[PDB]
């Protein structure tokens, strides 16, 4: 009751979240310096223990947050994200987790209010995009299957798999080395390969243009009214 | 009369189109697995016959649809598309048709209502573009002819044909390896080649920008009113 | 007087301009077929004389047009363009003119009304762009001079001239092989070369974005009112 | 008093700033010609002294400007820029300053009113971008650290440093040789490298799209009202 009110008044105070922010920036500087190998021979003893103390502080502070807000902490996406980040950082995963630990720096966007505002502004335009995202995914899946069965035996590196055909169709979509890297080599053996790729590029570019216009008229519809 | 009303009540029922949708997704999974050669040695006997039964079901179900709606089925673009897809899938074409058979997966967009809504939204912005499309096609045709007669003998691979000059001008338009892949090699022998290509890129980029702005002010004109 | 009224009624009749249009499309087909060398061994005798008769018809028909409208023909940009095109096509220029002759196909846009409408729509957005065009040209000129004097001796092919530095800065602007083609080779000898090019790319991209937004708010300003 | 009023009437007269403008354009022509080495053997004696007289004139004329407007000259960004430019041009820096001297040509934008108007129009859209700029910088910093610690030992040239990982992530962002130049070489040894780069590209492209839409709705918000 009084303990609760006092400890919640600590958890949702400014100085608490500010202290967490400043641990975040200091530890961001830390992880920036830890990529330097000469630096690590000299100061690795210190930098590792600094990461240890920040992570215990974070785990304690989500213990307090989750104490204050039991169900609503798990109903809240930002705190859900802080939980899952410190949890990943807490697990001892074949070293692939060491690189995942630096995701804790993303907590900066959850701790600081303006960053939180812009990333929710970013997520909010995604609902309107689901229709075109699914249209494009189906178009890519149908074309990936055709590109695989058309070019897979003679070009195993680029189209031998459904997965590699996704990859290289996605490359083509970004128009990166499309004709010189993939189409023209293909035409040295399959001469009408452009019949598959020119339409692919045209439809993909037009749908991608329509995606971005679709966004604007949404941000404008909330504006003119 | 009563038979008609009963069989039309079956054809335009939800469960019918839903069953067709679920055959579509199952067969999409099927065609996804059929690109895998090891999978096919094991289960090709089954996967081929699954494709056989889905295609007979589709042909039966367009027989029913076309029965219900004789003229209007052929006046309807989505059903016209389903007809032509199953028809392609029904024809025994030098194996080039085997890859065309996976176009049947596109029926998913015609069967499901939201996909149908977004692709007609996509087609509908095309009318407004016809003017600029034809302007660009004429500009490409005039430039393709000049690039052919300017660079064709000394660069047969890139400009020896009107068709190859279309191709490589289209490549340049996507700005993919423009100077490094085509212009600079050309300048090693024809030093003023940039006089042809820099304007080409400028006019092409400006017209393409104007295309996309042209789209927005159309989607906005239906909005502000 | 009556002769005038009758011959002007012929020049500004539909069938006259339509006949000119159909000569244009036939001759476009002609010039398309003339790039084919095997075709020319067979039918070059005919195709050349077809180009001769169309060009005499065009010169006669601008003689009539300029007869009808003396000063205003020269005050009119479309007719100014037809004049200069047939004039180029009439001059016997070291064969560089043979390729310029196909510019006569552009007369199609001047003869047909809808094409004329869209290309003036295209020209009309250019006035608003003069400010940013001149800002960019000054920025390119200042940077081209620095890139020349910084990298010209050790990289004569890319930056040895002010002209070659324009060219390759323009290439960088289109982001085509920027780091792999130019920056990274430069850094193998001049390690801080990115200090010149990263800002260049940032400012160039931001100004180019601002150019395109600048266009939209103009096309919208004529709309919301 | 009277001297002041007379000398301020000279400094803020048109002909004064116009004369400075014409020195600027003449000296721009000069610096354009100075990159030419054959030109310099012939006329370098003259061109260097021309640059000497223009720079003394500029230093005198900012002496007069700063005389007229003591505090407000330093409170004014355009005059602050002219000051710092002539000051750089006045310092005798291991020849790295010789190339910086051509920045004096940028004074043209500060002297001429329309250029001044468009560049402040350009700066003014930057405030609204700070939120997304900082979001992207944090995302790049977190990913640069992961790309360094994931790929640095086996790819020292592209990811051996935090700085080189910034560079090549920025390259990927411009989609320049992404898969062919970096991802596919990486996959020859680290096969799941796309799990790092495909998301990177998706999030980076979406945030960059949102940046540009963010700009438009700002330029439109000042318009519809
Ligand atoms: C919002 C996010 C802001 C991001 C701003 C980023 C500012 C820093 C970017 C770093 C750019 C330079 C990196 C670099 O040059 O790397 C070199 C070293 C590794 O080399 P090293 O092995 O030390 O080689 C020594 C060679 N020697 C003896 C001749 C000197 O590698 C390093 O030493 C890297 C040192 C990085 C310092 C950390 C900077 C933290 C900035 C603030 C981030 C806080 C937000 C979480
Ligand atoms: C986060 C919010 C929404 C995100 C929007 C995108 C959502 C859809 C994402 C794609 C869904 C399909 C994923 C997929 O098919 O994965 C297949 C492959 C498997 O890779 P793999 O076969 O292991 O790679 C081979 C390379 N090797 C052997 C030499 C190592 O892995 C890949 O190659 C994937 C390549 C990129 C595929 C992108 C597909 C784009 C579809 C439409 C995207 C939206 C456009 C607006
Ligand atoms: C709206 C459209 C949604 C699209 C979502 C796409 C999700 C699936 C993307 C597939 C990405 C991965 C593809 C891939 O990795 O290919 C590998 C195999 C071929 O290799 P394989 O010859 O089996 O090599 C065996 C090697 N061994 C023995 C060591 C294991 O190739 C395969 O096995 C591919 C298996 C694909 C499964 C089908 C997935 C269907 C997803 C739902 C689509 C329904 C809408 C029509
Ligand atoms: C679906 C809705 C509307 C679509 C908008 C585009 C409509 C216009 C499409 C193009 C019309 C002209 C087609 C054409 O000229 O085809 C010529 C070539 C023939 O190829 P080919 O000579 O067999 O290729 C040689 C390569 N080889 C020998 C080594 C195998 O084949 C090609 O290389 C074609 C290359 C692409 C040409 C694109 C022309 C773009 C014009 C404006 C496009 C619209 C921009 C908004
Ligand atoms: C608004 C503008 C519309 C533009 C639509 C463009 C439609 C035509 C695009 C041409 C695409 C194909 C070009 C092509 O494949 O070139 C091959 C030949 C040159 O090869 P050739 O030397 O004949 O080799 C013979 C080989 N052999 C004996 C085994 C057959 O090269 C040719 O034969 C080219 C023939 C082109 C025919 C002219 C088409 C005119 C279309 C309408 C344009 C009118 C508007 C002015
Ligand atoms: C039509 C309506 C308005 C058009 C907007 C653009 C207006 C401004 C155009 C550029 C003005 C300056 C032209 C210029 O500086 O020409 C220099 C070079 C000379 O070439 P050169 O030195 O012969 O090339 C060397 C290659 N080699 C020896 C191996 C054969 O030739 C080039 O390399 C030129 C390269 C492209 C320069 C583009 C400069 C862009 C400035 C801002 C463009 C507008 C962005 C919105
Ligand atoms: C708003 C900004 C407007 C910018 C407009 C730019 C117009 C000029 C662009 C220059 C493009 C051509 C550059 C070029 O071709 O470079 C060649 C020479 C260096 O070669 P060089 O060593 O002379 O070789 C001689 C070879 N020989 C004996 C056989 C003739 O290199 C040169 O001679 C370059 C000469 C450039 C002349 C200066 C042009 C000033 C234009 C107005 C700028 C005023 C605003 C500040
Ligand atoms: C002017 C108004 C606002 C401007 C917007 C951008 C503001 C943020 C800029 C970037 C801040 C971080 C700078 C940084 O981390 O510098 C690190 C490296 C150090 O280079 P270094 O390690 O010496 O390069 C190695 C190459 N070598 C050894 C072979 C010579 O140097 C680099 O490689 C930098 C590479 C480009 C980094 C761009 C980061 C973009 C973040 C978001 C950009 C805004 C997107 C809208
Ligand atoms: C919504 C729009 C949908 C657009 C869909 C378009 C699909 C069209 C795909 C075109 C694919 C072209 O791929 C085509 O494959 C066949 C099948 O082997 C090749 O066929 C042949 O190739 C060469 C011929 O010199 C030989 O090695 C061999 O005799 C044979 O395999 C064709 O020469 C090639 O051009
Ligand atoms: C709406 C805008 C329209 C823009 C249209 C612009 C068209 C301009 C095209 C410029 C083309 C340049 O192409 C030009 O071709 C001629 C004709 O052989 C070459 O001429 C020469 O090339 C080299 C010279 O070293 C020699 O091999 C040879 O003696 C000769 O063929 C020129 O050196 C080349 O620079
Ligand atoms: C069936 C679909 C209907 C077809 C019509 C749809 C449009 C298709 C256009 C062809 C696709 C290739 O698209 C190519 O993309 C590149 C991207 O670098 C464009 O380059 C772009 O540069 C600027 C700067 O970003 C853009 O504002 C502009 O849209 C475009 O000019 C090429 O100018 C464009 O041609
Ligand atoms: C509006 C924004 C304006 C932005 C303007 C930015 C301009 C900055 C330009 C940075 C250019 C870097 O170019 C720099 O040139 C000098 C001058 O030789 C090189 O200096 C040195 O290079 C290498 C060093 O290993 C040696 O061969 C040699 O001893 C020497 O020439 C630098 O190492 C290089 O990094
Ligand atoms: C006669 C025509 C009038 C000439 C003026 C018309 C504009 C011409 C611009 C030069 C054309 C090259 O166009 C080049 O396209 C590339 C596409 O990757 C742009 O790169 C682009 O990145 C972003 C992200 O998409 C775009 O929002 C932006 O438009 C542009 O900066 C280059 O910045 C631009 O310069
Ligand atoms: C907001 C979104 C955030 C997205 C973040 C995504 C991060 C995911 C990064 C995936 C990185 C893949 O990088 C992965 O690195 C490990 C660690 O060595 C490699 O592991 C192995 O590589 C090869 C295996 O043949 C061998 O040389 C060796 O035995 C081993 O090092 C993996 O095979 C590689 O695929
Ligand atoms: C001082 C200036 C202020 C700096 C901020 C201005 C923005 C600078 C951004 C960095 C420039 C590189 O710009 C790079 O252009 C490429 C063009 O292929 C973009 O790729 C683009 O793809 C799509 C499709 O066209 C565009 O709608 C979008 O704008 C962008 O994501 C990269 O995502 C972008 O990062
Ligand atoms: Na490229």
Author numbering:
A (entry chain A), B (entry chain A), C (entry chain A), D (entry chain A): 999 to 1090, 1094 to 1226
From the manuscript:
Here, we elucidated the mechanism of the divalent cation block by reproducing the blocking effect into NavAb, a well-studied tetrameric sodium channel. NavAb has three ion interaction sites in the selectivity filter, a high-energy-field site (SiteHFS), a centre site (SiteCEN), and an inner site (SiteIN). Our crystal structures of NavAb mutants show that the mutations increasing the hydrophilicity of the inner vestibule of the pore domain enable a divalent cation to stack on the ion pathway.
Previous studies have shown that the N49K mutation in the voltage sensor domain raises the activation potential, and the −140 mV holding potential can sufficiently maintain the channel function. The mutational site of N49K is far from SF. Therefore, to provide a stable current, the N49K mutation of NavAb was introduced into all constructs of NavAb in this study. In the ionic pathway of the N49K mutant, there is no differential density of the calcium ion condition subtracted with the electron density of the no calcium ion condition.
